Every structure is written in structure tokens, then in C-alpha cells.
Design a protein around this ligand. Structure first.
Ligand SMILES: [Cl-]
Length: 283
């Protein structure tokens, strides 16, 4: 079933370089993938820990069959899976700089507006593509965005990704909701759409420009729900262009139909990158 969207990789082609983390289903590793005719490719390897439940196997490999459906430079690329032997692996591209929120915290105030808008343009490009493909991410946050050595940002973590149902275009939950990133109608009614992903994306915009501030700081989950419901919105980060902050507000429209489409976001961001007013340096 995962084989319809993922290539089976001969185990001998993977060598594990280092263990770099632990996910829900076991270790995450940096490794090398050797394909015929080329240099070893650096890869991220998710391993299914020994003694897993069979439900855990389905759900682990579940993400891989979601990933394998996408082919886009701002979505983490699947190299394939190992299923014919133990341990069971999912092999993705390697992102040198890890999570976006962490990366920006180490580099507080280090980027230009163009550099940061550039990151946000990449993220919205991948989301646009996801939207088009009939998926809702549901878990869009800076901490679920990965960034490479060229500062290219990619959507990652498709544990909560679901396929949109054919209606007047939503998924309804069955509840591991990240509240401060979530659109109000998704919180209240548990109705998830590309437009709730745009709300989350507004949050990501604010995190990126803030260099990895927690949205709403020490506010409790109840504090946030009530605040947003009342009309409160996060204030403008330091050194944020007015038009960027206004795009954030646009994403945070209470009525989802009023948020811009991802394609609209990408176009607005391209316009900023192409506007010399936003370039601190002209030589
Ligand atoms: Cl301005």
C-alpha cells in the first residue's frame, strides 16, 4: 500500500551516519543513500523501533505514502522506504539546518526582509501545491518546517495531514490539535480546510519575522482562544514591513472565505521580493 507511492530501497544502499533524534515511532537518523551512478546522497532516516505494535507500523508507514504523493521543492522529498527487512525505514531528503523555529532563534536579527520573505515564499509555494493536491496539513508551524543549507524552507511532518473530502472542502477530526496555530472554526467545529492552513501560515509568518517567538507568549490555551474569538490579533514584530503585517492580519480573518488563497500569498510575496523599496541594499 505504501509501495504504490514509495519505492522499496535495498537495505545495503543505506548506511546510518548518526542518530540525530527520536520521533514518535523511533529514532531519526542522518545517513547516506547510495544510488547507482552517483555520489552518496545525504538522507534523513526514520526508523521503526523494535517491538512496535502493528498499528504503529501502519501509522509510521502511513506518513510515507502521504509524502510519496508529492513532488515539490518546498515539500520534503521521499527517497523511499525499507519494508522487506528490519528495521523498517523511511528515507527522506536531509535538511542541514533542522527546524525553522530553532534555526531562527540562533540567528536573531541576522536576516534581511528579503531573506525572510524568501523563506515565507517557499513555505507558501509548498502549501499551495498541497492545497491543489487535495490535502490539508493541520499542523503547520515553524517547528514543523525544515530549512536547508541554502535557506530553502520545506513543509514537513505529515502525521496530521488528511485528504480533503468533497463538499461545499473539509476534513473533520477524530484530536491532537495545536491550539495557538489553529484557525477558530477548526478549534470550535473541528472543520479543517486549506483556509485553516492559511491561518496557521499567518502564525508561521509571525514566528519567522519574530525569530521564533512562541505565538501569544505565556498566554494559556484558554487565554488565546478567548482573545482571538474577541478580535485580538498578534501585534507586528519588530522591523516588520507594514504590508507583511497586513498580510498576516488577512490570514487571521475570522471568516475563512476572506483569507487569501495560497496562490494569492505567493504572488504578494513575489511582489515584495521584486519591490526595491524592501531592499536595504541597491548596490
Ligand atoms: Cl514599510
Amino acid at each position: 500500500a505504501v509501495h504504490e507511492f514509495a519505492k522499496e530501497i535495498e537495505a545495503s544502499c543505506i548506511t546510518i551516519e548518526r542518530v540525530i533524534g527520536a520521533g514518535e515511532f523511533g529514532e531519526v537518523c542522518s545517513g547516506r543513500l547510495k544510488l547507482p551512478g552517483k555520489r552518496e546522497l545525504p538522507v534523513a532516516i526514520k526508523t521503526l523501533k523494535v517491538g512496535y505494535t502493528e498499528k504503529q507500523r501502519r501509522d509510521f508507514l502511513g506518513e510515507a505514502s502521504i509524502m510519496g504523493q508529492f513532488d515539490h521543492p518546498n515539500i520534503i522529498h521521499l527517497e523511499g522506504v525499507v519494508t522487506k527487512s528490519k528495521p523498517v525505514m523511511i528515507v527522506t531528503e536531509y535538511m542541514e539546518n533542522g527546524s525553522l523555529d530553532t534555526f531562527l532563534k540562533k540567528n536573531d536579527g541576522q536576516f534581511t526582509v528579503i531573506q525572510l520573505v524568501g523563506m515565507l515564499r517557499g513555505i507558501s509555494a509548498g502549501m499551495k501545491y498541497l492545497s491543489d493536491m487535495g490535502y490539508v496539513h493541520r499542523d503547520l508551524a515553524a517547528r514543523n518546517i525544515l530549512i536547508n543549507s541554502n535557506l530553502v524552507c520545506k513543509v514537513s511532518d505529515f502525521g496530521l495531514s488528511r485528504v480533503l473530502e468533497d463538499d461545499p472542502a473539509a476534513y473533520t477530526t477524530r484530536g491532537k490539535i495545536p491550539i495557538r496555530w489553529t484557525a477558530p472554526e477548526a478549534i470550535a467545529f473541528r472543520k479543517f480546510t486549506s483556509a485553516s492552513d492559511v491561518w496557521s501560515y499567518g502564525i508561521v509568518m509571525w514566528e519567522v519575522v519574530s525569530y521564533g517567538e512562541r505565538p501569544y507568549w505565556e498566554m494559556t490555551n484558554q487565554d488565546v482562544i478567548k482573545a482571538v474569538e474577541e478580535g485580538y490579533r498578534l501585534p507586528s514584530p519588530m522591523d516588520c514591513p507594514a504590508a507583511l503585517y497586513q498580510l498576516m492580519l488577512d490570514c487571521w480573518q475570522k471568516e475563512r472565505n476572506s483569507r487569501p488563497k495560497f496562490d494569492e500569498i505567493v504572488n504578494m510575496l513575489d511582489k515584495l521580493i521584486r519591490n526595491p523599496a524592501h531592499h536595504h541594499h541597491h548596490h
